[PDB]
Amino acid sequence: SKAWNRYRLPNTLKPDSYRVTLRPYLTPNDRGLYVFKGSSTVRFTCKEATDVIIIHSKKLNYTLSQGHRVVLRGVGGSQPPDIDKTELVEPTEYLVVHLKGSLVKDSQYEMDSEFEGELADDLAGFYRSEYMEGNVRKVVATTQMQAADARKSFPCFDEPAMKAEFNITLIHPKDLTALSNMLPKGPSTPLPEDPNWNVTEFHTTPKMSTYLLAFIVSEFDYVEKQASNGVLIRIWARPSAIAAGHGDYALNVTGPILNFFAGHYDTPYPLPKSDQIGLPDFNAGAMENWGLVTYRENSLLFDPLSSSSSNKERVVTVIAHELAHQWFGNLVTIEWWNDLWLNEGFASYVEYLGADYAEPTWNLKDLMVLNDVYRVMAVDALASSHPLSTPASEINTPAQISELFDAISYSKGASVLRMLSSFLSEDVFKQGLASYLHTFAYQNTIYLNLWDHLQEAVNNRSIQLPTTVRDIMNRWTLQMGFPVITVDTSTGTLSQEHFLLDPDSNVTRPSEFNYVWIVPITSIRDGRQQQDYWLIDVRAQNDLFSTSGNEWVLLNLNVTGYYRVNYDEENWRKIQTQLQRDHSAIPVINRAQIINDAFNLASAHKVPVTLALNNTLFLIEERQYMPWEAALSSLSYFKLMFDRSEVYGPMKNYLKKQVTPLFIHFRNNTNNWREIPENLMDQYSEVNAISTACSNGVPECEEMVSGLFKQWMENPNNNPIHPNLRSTVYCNAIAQGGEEEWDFAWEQFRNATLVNEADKLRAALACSKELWILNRYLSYTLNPDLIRKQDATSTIISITNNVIGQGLVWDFVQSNWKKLFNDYGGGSFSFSNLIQAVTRRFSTEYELQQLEQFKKDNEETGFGSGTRALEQALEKTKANIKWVKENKEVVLQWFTENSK
Amino acid sequence: IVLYVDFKLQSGVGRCFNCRPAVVNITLANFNETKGPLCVDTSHFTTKFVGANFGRWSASINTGNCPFSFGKVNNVCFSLKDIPGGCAMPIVANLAYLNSYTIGTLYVS
């Protein structure tokens, strides 16, 4: 009822500019706490009279001056009423200043505040990061303000629409550097009170959102290179890392990608610099802070001699994603978090446009089908998903906000962006985005504003679409899910319906469009592209989809559109024979579509499961990477359902037969594993062949990965395992080995100097088959001295991936959830990801009981960021019980027969 | 002849590791800028080179505009100042697989 009890801010006060001064103490005080002292002065205009000031604040202690937590002053002759009392409302994280009188409309006011906070290792707000230089424990003060943690460093109106200018100041030790969004406004002047401390004031920022602020204080070095658009680029990181040259690669691509995005979207980069800094302790992968982008070390650094090609891809993709945010999210922000897909959906699509420019020989845009489209289809098929644009009233609390940073906003947004640019064409799509950026620069927008400017581009270019741009995209944005296109090639009929993994699931969400989509269908006939078609009705008919004799069709060419396709039994048979005759006749991207769609269709009871498994028969003579991966991905679901049952044995034998020819081929192609493929895709094919070969019991692989690891143990300094193979060779060699191999890989993980190497070691240690080792290793994941809090959740997710640890982690989660939730509430621990991963195997009514009881027990404690993930687990589990009962026998039959 | 080349990186914290060195100390043995370019008295003479080699940063003398290599006793006057009618073969400070900087020139004619 009260204003300060609601989670949304009042429109009465709107900020204009901020003055902030922070001072981190990188040493523990006598209480043992790393603290930071700060002072802030915010100038705001009163748009509506009110007798109370509501401003965000979180975990902040205020110095009392003039008997109150803040001091209110006037601007331009305005009379600030006396403050009656100030209070802190913890639930909604507010700082309520009750006044004796009301404020004048159209009058500016300034509010002073002196406060203190903790420089915790919770990777949120103004937090600390630590590393080791020689034998010294270096400490760093970094920042993570997304989504609503800027209130954790200084009081402000922490909302994306409350844009303003920030006059940042950083009081740090003399022997340390201070960085921020802008460049220093003159050199650092030693603080007069104490010459052991310097002061660095930074230039005023442009109109930006609070969640984009960043204040870093480190002793890092850097490497720089003036970009092609005059922007200064700097790659900050630990001294030893910079010296060894791990930042050189990011320096090579950052500049060019930045300038590429500038030209592609006809919009310059406003700021004079863009710093890329790599923290040792970061929660997410990276943050798009305007001017000072922050990265995980594994997302920015790269060692040409010990990093893998997939690590190099990670870096460029992450950099591109972050640099794209400079335009979509920073220059043009969202009105409210409910439209998060406008920032992360654009970046997740544009990340490929930039990466393809940096490394064009990689053809990375093709991987978007597997890494994005099908990554989100698995969750968007559930009735517990959410639309791309949830209503603003449905998102209010911080938990509900952090929850939206999921595959839907990232991947489905990217998939919708893919489908949009394919039927609009890139050159046209680029146009509308340029007008959309220029208009709403330094402002905030909603999904509607985008339709307006995209519709204009259709008018200038005279593009013909079945209807307005607003009405075609509203079908994919306002309502969740996606359709399944059922084709009757005998009669050329076309049908569509809401695809659900569990046909019995109860769709609760209402849709103004009643779950009917307007999909652009692209098809091919015997390997020849047909005329594009638009489906505006629930059921249609067209000659484009009719066949006769040997003629066969395939809809959704290169999977540009975000929808699954299913054909009649006859057409499937013609496709299967075509794959056995000459699979090269099918687009490599669509070969993956055939496998992925069929498997997900079987799960939906739309086609027999025996069909999907038949589509994986041609893989025995398949050399590409993408089709094999699509199968291994869909088959991972079979591993989850059957790796604790009689069905696994036969499954391993069938895979062991399908992959062995490829493994032998790469042994001859790689000169006995001495070299790697030149093409990046083939490099990944080699790895997927080695991992699948060893996981399924090919003894030649098992004898090789063990012999390599043993050679390494003999000469630890000289690692003979090529980076691309280290990931897979490590996991298998530790599972086959014993404690002597586990301790050696543990010794390596502690003494490691490269995070890419440590990450491979950390995961591989979770492959031990000994139950006592996994139990010991689990207790390590909660010791910040042994495993970084930023890697805790990940390491636990790796142990549960082990069939011997599946029950150990589930028991661990059930027993100490509250303790695990209270301690890591809103910190370095992601609860959604862990829930999603621990429940993946549930397939029995007993497990469903355990999960439903887990929900009932901890309903008082809550789940926050994992609420939706819990419901999705409950639905996916109920579906798994039916699926296994229905297919346990038929599947076992198919694996045993085709394994011979 | 015994050319000593050396250089130091931007000191302090927050240093730019690949920027142009902050200090340069190119010193030709038994050479006086004021007396003038010292010439090789005899074809029998030993020429050594002592460039800085720390980590990935190294200093070397690559002969560019002059068709003779420093270090070969076989087959002219050498100076650190511009001598007329002569070629300018520069002295560089290299960063492995990254940018490099010309810190000084060893002239010859």
Ligand SMILES: *[C@@H]1O[C@H](CO)[C@@H](O[C@@H]2O[C@H](CO)[C@@H](O[C@@H]3O[C@H](CO)[C@@H](O)[C@H](O)[C@@H]3O)[C@H](O)[C@H]2NC(C)=O)[C@H](O)[C@H]1NC(C)=O
């Ligand atoms: C913290 O502030 C102190 C004092 O401002 C900085 O120390 C001084 O930094 C300046 C700028 O780099 C240097 O000034 C020097 O002046 C001499 C003339 O005496 C001039 O020849 C140099 O070219 C240079 O401009 C000076 O080296 C340095 N003084 C010392 C020895 O401390 C300090 O750099 C600041 N620290 C940080 C991390 O900002």
Ligand SMILES: *[C@@H]1O[C@H](CO)[C@@H](O[C@@H]2O[C@H](CO)[C@@H](O)[C@H](O)[C@H]2NC(C)=O)[C@H](O)[C@H]1NC(C)=O
């Ligand atoms: C579908 O995707 C395939 C693979 O990405 C595309 O095939 C490539 O086409 C380009 C020309 O655009 C050629 O230069 C490449 O050599 C092809 N790669 C192959 C076949 O290995 C194909 O163009 C895409 N088709 C459409 C129209 O989307």
Ligand SMILES: *[C@@H]1O[C@H](CO)[C@@H](O)[C@H](O)[C@H]1NC(C)=O
């Ligand atoms: C911030 O600095 C700008 C430019 O110097 C100034 O106009 C503005 O009033 C300052 N704001 C505050 C709150 O100090």
Ligand SMILES: *[C@@H]1O[C@H](CO)[C@@H](O)[C@H](O)[C@H]1NC(C)=O
């Ligand atoms: C702020 O005050 C609370 C007690 O009200 C205390 O527990 C907390 O440690 C204080 N913050 C800091 C940084 O000391």
Ligand SMILES: *[C@@H]1O[C@H](CO)[C@@H](O)[C@H](O)[C@H]1NC(C)=O
């Ligand atoms: C799978 O193929 C086998 C023969 O290769 C056949 O016996 C079986 O009926 C097929 N299943 C379907 C439904 O395609």
Ligand SMILES: *[C@@H]1O[C@H](CO)[C@@H](O)[C@H](O)[C@H]1NC(C)=O
């Ligand atoms: C320059 O190098 C020579 C090499 O011996 C050394 O003797 C001299 O002291 C150096 N001068 C500087 C700048 O220290």
Ligand SMILES: *[C@@H]1O[C@H](CO)[C@@H](O)[C@H](O)[C@H]1NC(C)=O
């Ligand atoms: C170099 O030549 C000048 C000019 O005669 C004179 O200072 C002296 O001869 C030489 N100086 C040194 C340092 O030997």
Ligand SMILES: *[C@@H]1O[C@H](CO)[C@@H](O)[C@H](O)[C@H]1NC(C)=O
């Ligand atoms: C960056 O580019 C430079 C020059 O093109 C190249 O020498 C260097 O190897 C590249 N850095 C890396 C490690 O990719």
Ligand SMILES: [Zn+2]
């Ligand atoms: Zn992002």
